[PDB]
């Protein structure tokens, strides 16, 4: 347990956007208290996460410390300005945060952080419709922002306009063909959206996600259940009926195999057997 090890752990926990605020805030506090001078400016990015975790963790005592250090180091910085905006939003102080973001925008119009923070404020206030409208307007100038695209898709899913969410996930897959998570989420959204005309797309995209990653057993039994629903639908044609029955049988075989592997990996009561007891039904 050396400061390099926790530094690498924090770097990994930053590269993939985790939100285990307690662990990251504890590690960051240890780093900035014990090994603050053991390494150079690489802690400064840490000083971002550490405060955000604090706002997530509720421990506001060190949020002021980190903010004051960053401000005294970086006067008139748009990143630190957004960070102050988040500090203000931590206590639902929305008017001052909005004014600060407007000042940032009038100082620099190409900044994208201020728009995202202001729409985060709007969605925190519960005005979902105006938040969706603001995101739609913001994308009209910044088509291609994958993060905002996925956030808009998630908001549409929450508000249950599954057509727009499916469209946004389609264009997200356009952006990133090789991410199986997007394919799985789009298959789920399409399955939830409607019937056979969308069930076919859902099962095709579930198969695509399985091809892109064999371990996504979530999408595995998602494909299984989509095929089963297609089978149970009277409108399915005879050739479609036998095709989806074959797909369901293959998926069931894969599910029994996967749960047998789950069995050999652990050592306990055979709940996985109970699990395939469900498949036999």
């Amino acid at each position: 347990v050396t400061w390099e090890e926790m530094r690498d752990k924090m770097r990994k926990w930053r590269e993939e956007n985790s939100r285990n605020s307690e662990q990251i805030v504890e590690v960051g506090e240890e780093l900035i208290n014990e090994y603050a001078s053991k390494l150079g400016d690489d802690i400064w990015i840490i000083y971002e996460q550490v405060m955000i975790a604090a706002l997530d963790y509720g421990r506001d005592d060190l949020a002021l410390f980190c903010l004051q250090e960053l401000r005294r180091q970086f006067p008139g910085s748009h990143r630190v300005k957004r960070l102050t905006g988040m500090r203000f939003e931590a206590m639902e102080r929305y008017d001052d945060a909005i004014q600060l973001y407007d000042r940032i925008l009038q100082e620099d119009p190409t900044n994208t952080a201020a728009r995202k923070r202001k729409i985060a404020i709007r969605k925190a206030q519960g005005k979902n419709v105006e938040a969706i409208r603001e995101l739609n307007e913001y994308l009209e100038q910044f088509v291609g922002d994958q993060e905002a695209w996925h956030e808009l898709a998630e908001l549409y899913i929450n508000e249950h306009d599954y057509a727009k969410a499916a469209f946004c996930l389609e264009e997200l897959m356009m952006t990133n063909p090789h991410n199986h998570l997007y394919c799985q989420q789009y298959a789920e959204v399409k399955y939830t959206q409607g019937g056979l005309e969308n069930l076919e797309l859902s099962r095709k995209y579930f198969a695509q996600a399985l091809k892109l990653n064999n371990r996504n057993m979530r999408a595995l039994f998602g494909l299984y259940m989509s095929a089963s629903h297609i089978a149970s639908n009277p409108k399915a044609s005879a050739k479609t009926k036998k095709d989806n029955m074959k797909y369901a049988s293959w998926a069931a075989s894969q599910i029994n195999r996967a749960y047998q592997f789950a069995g050999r990996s652990k050592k306990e009561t055979k709940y996985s057997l109970k699990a395939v007891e469900d498949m036999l039904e």
């Binding site: 997530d56 929450n158 789920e188 399955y191 996967a258 990996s265 709940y271 109970k274 699990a275």
Partner: protein, 192 residues
């Protein structure tokens, strides 16, 4: 007439603490004034997706009927602090689960009252009558042993047991994580 065990409340607090930033949901199973003997969590964050909910409910029904329980309640904790009313997902899920047994009623973890010790009962129980869902009396007693629930929730949260808690979503990530989470059950037994 909705009654849930103290372990159900501690599981509620555990799942709320595991993913504080994401809205969560799940089911509560009971044997055939109904007493919710046990509970089970499922997913977090995005909750409007159907396929996971369907596969979940099917697995809950299989596991419960294999071991004589039946699913009899639905819980959902929303993301927003100032939000305490059910959404479409919660309403439809509660209506569908209530189709089997009329005694099934919805419960929602009011995150506004979520504290370290859980001074006041966070859960609010909603009943379906006249084809409408409406809350019960807040002044009613909800847990079977309120001081016991308070102390066990405080001990579990202070023991950092929420990180070890596993819901259905982690089972989906990897089956090696036990979705039946008997670990919190043995911790409850040891604490009691």
């Amino acid at each position: 007439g909705v009654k849930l065990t103290t372990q159900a409340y501690c599981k509620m607090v555990l799942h709320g603490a595991k993913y504080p930033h994401c809205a969560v949901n799940g089911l509560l199973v009971a044997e055939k004034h109904t007493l919710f003997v046990d509970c089970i969590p499922l997913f977090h964050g995005t909750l409007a997706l159907a396929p996971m909910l369907e596969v979940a409910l099917t697995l809950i029904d299989s596991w419960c009927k294999d071991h004589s329980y039946v699913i009899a309640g639905y819980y959902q904790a929303n993301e927003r602090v100032k939000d305490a009313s059910p959404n479409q997902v919660a309403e439809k899920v509660a209506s569908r689960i209530a189709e089997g047994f009329s005694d099934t009623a919805l419960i929602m973890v009011d995150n506004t009252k979520f504290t370290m010790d859980c001074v006041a009962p966070t859960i609010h129980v909603y009943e379906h009558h006249e084809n409408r869902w409406r809350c019960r009396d807040p002044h009613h007693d909800y847990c079977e042993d309120w001081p016991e629930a308070q102390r066990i929730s405080a001990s579990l949260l202070d023991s950092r047991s929420y990180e070890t808690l596993v819901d259905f979503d982690n089972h989906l990530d990897d089956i090696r994580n036990d979705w039946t989470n008997p670990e919190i059950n043995k911790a409850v037994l040891h604490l009691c």
